[PDB]
């Protein structure tokens, strides 16, 4: 019948990437592209998705020309921005960063009035997009990496899970500061990105221990270890929405007595939503939809297991 069918009852409510049924509506080519790389899972980080989406929307905006009868505030969101929204959302379920950025964007759009020049509206929006990318994403990434890196000291053993852009840049920075330390890289054997991160670290000159899975976890997360974890978003109640397996590492470290540090940009902070379990907000693997073989992309890490959170906000 349908792919949705055959999903176990407990997990019926959870969304899954149905991809594209591709057929193109009056969507922008950049949005189309970004959307089908979301369908391909070429971009699975919420930040990469956010940034690609922002550039796509940027090119949507600067090509947009107001009809003579219409006003930009009145016409653009309903007939232009929204089609892009639903095409993307139906390529793959939106992560929080995109949702938040979208709500902010439309917040800035409805401040606009009928008596506004279109040009002024357009590069108001454009200089907002540029500011968002520059200070919420790029500069934020830099600062988070630096500040987290000064936390690391010589002789430390750092533990990380999978490959995270913030974590990867933090460790690289720490090594470039002349610091000498050990990195233990844990991986999802179903994803396997950690190996590449591990290889990159070796090139960097940082000795590292690679583990394809979470077996023998107690062994490689001693109390002395510092575990640096990244995610897709942080909920209002303080819990970390992260790639599956994260909460396991976080707890293991926490009840080992090891410090748990989460690296995250403020964009990913969701002040509206609270999650107390992994089932409330999760996404199903398109290949592992079936009952015979089943997998969830994300898990929830309670604040119990988080020692601290490092963000772009320095003061």
């Amino acid at each position: 019948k349908d792919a949705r069918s055959g999903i176990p009852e407990c997990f019926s409510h959870i969304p899954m990437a149905k991809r594209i049924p591709q057929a193109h509506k009056d969507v922008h080519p950049a949005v189309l592209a970004v959307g089908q790389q979301m369908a391909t899972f070429a971009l699975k980080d919420s930040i990469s998705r956010l940034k690609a989406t922002l550039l796509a929307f940027r090119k949507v905006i600067e090509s947009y020309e107001t009809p003579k009868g219409n006003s930009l505030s009145r016409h653009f969101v309903p007939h232009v921005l929204n089609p892009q929204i639903e095409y993307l959302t139906e390529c793959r379920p939106m992560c929080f960063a995109m949702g938040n950025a979208i709500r902010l964007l439309k917040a800035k759009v409805n401040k606009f009035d009928i008596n506004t020049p279109e040009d002024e509206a357009k590069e108001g929006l454009l200089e907002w997009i540029d500011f968002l990318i520059n200070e919420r994403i790029t500069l934020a990434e830099y600062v988070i990496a630096r500040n987290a890196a000064q936390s690391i000291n010589d002789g430390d053993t750092i533990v990380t899970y999978g490959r995270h852009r913030l974590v990867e840049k933090t460790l690289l920075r720490a090594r470039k500061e002349g610091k000498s330390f050990n990195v233990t890289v844990l991986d999802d054997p179903y994803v396997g990105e950690g190996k590449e991160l591990a290889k990159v670290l070796r090139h960097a000159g940082i000795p590292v221990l690679y583990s394809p899975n979470l077996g023998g976890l107690r062994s490689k997360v001693p109390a002395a270890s510092n575990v640096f974890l990244g995610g897709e978003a942080i909920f209002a109640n303080g819990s970390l929405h992260a790639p599956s397996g994260t909460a396991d590492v976080a707890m293991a470290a926490t009840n080992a007595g090891a410090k748990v540090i989460v690296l995250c940009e403020t964009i990913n902070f969701d002040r509206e939503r609270v999650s107390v379990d992994a089932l409330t907000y999760n996404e199903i693997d398109p290949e592992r939809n079936t009952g015979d073989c089943f997998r969830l992309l994300f898990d929830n890490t309670h604040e119990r297991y988080i020692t601290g959170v490092i963000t772009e906000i320095e003061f």
């Binding site: 999802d188 054997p189 062994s219 909460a247």
Partner: protein, 303 residues
Amino acid sequence: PSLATWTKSLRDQSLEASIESLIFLLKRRQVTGDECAGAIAQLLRQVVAKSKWHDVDQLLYRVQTAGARLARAAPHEPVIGNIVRRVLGLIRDEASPFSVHALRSEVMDGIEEILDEINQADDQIASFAEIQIHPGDYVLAYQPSKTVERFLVKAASKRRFTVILASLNPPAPGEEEQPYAALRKKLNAAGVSTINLASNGLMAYIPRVNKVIFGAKAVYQNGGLLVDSGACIAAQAAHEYLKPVIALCGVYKFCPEDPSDEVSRGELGTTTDYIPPDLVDVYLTNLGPQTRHHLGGIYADHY
């Protein structure tokens, strides 16, 4: 090659040839779990049969020499040592004006009773399954050994419940088949619902399950377990949510000492993991459910 075939050679094969054929077989890791123990017993029996001896002391010498070689062969299975030590004890308590022939036939039949106890340990354990599993229960069976599978199968006969199957690694690309198909169909036949997790990390799913079950390769005096790799993530995740952790083990796998610090760390093998005793709430044996303080006693019985 075939475990059964090695058995035929053992019956008609030279003792030395059979010894290092069992050794090659242990190193290959084709032998799994309890079968290993049984094989040891058979071999030790054959040792006693052909084992170059005119008094109890070399019987002990060759059973310990051979046993040492098999123990060294497969460090991951400590059940070997246990079997050996019981065989020795058996010999010395029926050591005491009679011919060796009298001793040899008595030791050998003692070993046959060791062997058949080993062989119905699983059904004896499974007799407690109906008691431990309730209607509507949610059972996380982690990487189920056949002990666990008949536990679940005879649980299924008198109960309606759901089994959640977790495995440490994804299926190999060569196999091109997803796992526990046999277990899953004998379970579905009985009316038991099954969900097979392709997840590494069980934290997301643990609050939903009611209890965790796995087989143990060894049980130490302190209450520690030697298990398959990744069983410990299940045990800990369950422990934090106060989910009962049930370990299925025959009395023969009970080791009489605390684990070596290499085992305790987790450096043994890594194919196996160590679980400290505080993460295990129930030890289920053929004799019944045994709990930590009681363990020290039964280890004394075994040797």
